[PDB]
Write an enzyme that holds these catalytic residues in place. Structure first.
Site, mmCIF file in Angstrom:
data_model
loop_
_atom_site.group_PDB
_atom_site.id
_atom_site.type_symbol
_atom_site.label_atom_id
_atom_site.label_comp_id
_atom_site.label_asym_id
_atom_site.label_seq_id
_atom_site.Cartn_x
_atom_site.Cartn_y
_atom_site.Cartn_z
ATOM 1 N N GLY A 169 1.950 13.783 24.461
ATOM 2 C CA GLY A 169 2.602 12.167 23.583
ATOM 3 C C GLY A 169 3.130 12.171 22.803
ATOM 4 C CG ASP A 170 1.372 9.819 19.807
ATOM 5 O OD1 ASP A 170 2.925 9.185 20.373
ATOM 6 O OD2 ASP A 170 0.581 8.750 19.042
#
Lengths: 151, 151
Positions: free
Chosen positions: A17-18
DNA sequence: GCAAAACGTCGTGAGACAGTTTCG
DNA sequence: CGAAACTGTCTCACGACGTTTTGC
């Protein structure tokens, strides 16, 4: 260091995700091939949430957090711990597994890359692949740029 | 449906990264108290990676994917499946666990929120709390808005 | 009358590099 | 020399809502 599988599962989702798995070729006159092969595993998060990144330093046992205003990053560059960590994390990655595997490949091939220009350039080729797998938007130095300087 | 634990561990990390647990009070005349209480679980990703969201539709088994240009979103708003889903996901969440537990609470109290304006308000206050936990920056309707209308 | 889908958008919170420096 | 840190910022790829329409 052997990591817990639950920590790794959650973290691989979070990294997909990040996170970011980065390989760079940095022009630098002090290296014999005039470029440094740089590798970085990072996780970016809003600074009010750096506690999450500070915990990572503790849980992973290596790396650090840099602040850059509104966001912060957990950064891990030491190749030894990086290889150890990515090796255990990659089985659980879904979006950035190919990048992880290319980085592990580069790391292991580093010593050989320091000995030969053709090998070094080959390794630079795998950096090109990582960047093409990422949402690369401001890259400048590629294997092509390195070939021209060697010639 | 009961989800595999490793699936949920990975997904919780992915959700803490690219996901959003949303609660909204939507002004709408056809409702008794003039607002709809809307809850949404979503995951946003660049459309080139739409396959990952489509895969989630199949793995979670409910919900759908919508397109909005350069990015797409996996969306889950059906209250019952959402409640079942978040119940199993929340234990593994780290940045959005509070939001998830508040959404669960709101859903459980929806029936009674429907029978009393004061209960409606109290639940709308739980929606305030979710927005405060997220990185809210364009919210317009709050429990204060509803409080004014209920007069 | 409410659940759920559909369609639309603000302002980032990320991702992914670049360039320069430190010092065993 | 070279592993690794230090510092900067570009270009989004997100998050987190908002408004309107369906459908039973």
């Amino acid at each position: 260091t052997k990591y817990n599988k639950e920590f790794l599962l959650y973290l691989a989702g979070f990294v997909d995700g990040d996170g970011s798995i980065i390989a760079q070729i940095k022009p630098n006159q002090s290296y014999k091939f005039k470029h440094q092969l740089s590798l970085t595993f990072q996780v970016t998060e809003k600074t009010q949430r750096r506690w999450f990144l500070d915990k990572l330093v503790d849980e992973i046992g290596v790396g650090y957090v840099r602040d850059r205003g509104s966001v912060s990053d957990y950064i891990l560059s030491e190749i030894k711990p990086l290889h150890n960590f990515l090796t255990q994390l990659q089985p659980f990655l879904k979006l950035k597994q190919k990048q992880a595997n290319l980085v592990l490949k580069i790391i292991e091939q580093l010593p050989s890359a320091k000995e030969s220009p053709d090998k070094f350039l080959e390794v630079c080729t795998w950096v090109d692949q990582i960047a093409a797998l990422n949402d690369s938007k401001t890259r400048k130095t590629t294997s092509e740029t390195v070939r021209a300087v060697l010639d």
